[PDB]
Point group: C2
Chain length 173, copies 2
């Protein structure tokens, strides 16, 4: 362990999408840096998925995010969104969060958005979303949340690379 970065998937995101992104983030982190940042891959899908792991990455399945939470645009999302928010409010409270990146459609975006913009301005926070070109006010609110429009390796690549950029340059100042 070390300072962490999170690649996050929602229901929407297919395994191979998340793998490519995490792989590209890590690589790029290593490549941009001047010599280290870990890549924790987290699943926050509201529906079950036949996979509680992501290649060789430190993982945290949807059951675990959820676990750390106590009890309106869906109940499922309302629940998980909250559980995510608390989850990385902790890892940021440990001063061990260099940024977060996730992908989702309209549902997944609205899940990640709120959980993300609850993080201090300046903390790299990225969402590769299919609702980027449209009304974003409700997602970005009044914060520095970046929405990359849509997934495709070329766009996964630039998003991934853009995130590595913000992180590294923020940590190497």
């Amino acid at each position: 362990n070390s300072p962490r970065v999170f690649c996050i998937g929602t229901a929407d995101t297919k395994f191979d999408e998340l793998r490519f992104l995490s792989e590209h983030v890590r690589s790029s982190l290593n490549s941009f840096s001047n010599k280290k940042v870990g890549v924790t891959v987290v699943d926050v899908s509201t529906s079950w998925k036949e996979t509680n792991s992501c290649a060789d990455f430190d993982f945290v399945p949807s059951k675990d995010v959820l676990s750390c939470h106590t009890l309106t645009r869906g109940l499922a999302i309302a629940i998980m969104s909250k559980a995510l928010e608390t989850f990385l409010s902790i890892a940021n409270d440990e001063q061990n969060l260099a940024g977060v990146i996730g992908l989702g459609g309209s549902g997944g975006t609205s899940l990640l958005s709120s959980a993300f913009r609850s993080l201090p301005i300046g903390i790299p926070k990225v969402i590769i979303s299919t609702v980027a070109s449209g009304q974003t006010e409700s997602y970005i609110g009044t914060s520095d949340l970046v929405l990359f429009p849509s997934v495709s390796k070329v766009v996964l690549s630039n998003a991934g690379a853009a995130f590595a950029g913000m992180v590294i340059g923020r940590l190497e100042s």
Copy 2:
């Protein structure tokens, strides 16, 4: 010419923000490289407030942008006033300039600043570029209705958050981030 990157804005009012961000794009591009990409600041202002250089950056004045463009349909557009006609002609002249840079495959990326007016100017031209070339816009409008600006492209809007215009505490951290985000996209694409 080596790969090249344009940091674009209306320097007549955003000079400090442009310099600052380019300062950051440049050092990040350096830092993150393993090898050499130039940073060119370019002015698209249409006001009397004329600007001739930006620190020690390669610089192209708004009249240089203008001079590579032949007038077209833009001239006969609507327009509440002549400022808006200047903005439209400039926007199209940017489109040509960028397009020329990309035909001469100098073009490794574009980034820009702007409010409502800048963002329309940069949008229109940034999206004429093929998908994949890094194109970012630090805009006070990213939080709102973006369909207009991004259309169907890969253009990314960075929200301006705003501790205000100019440079201070929290606009700085988004400018840095935007800068480094852009740098990583450019290097990553070139060293991939």
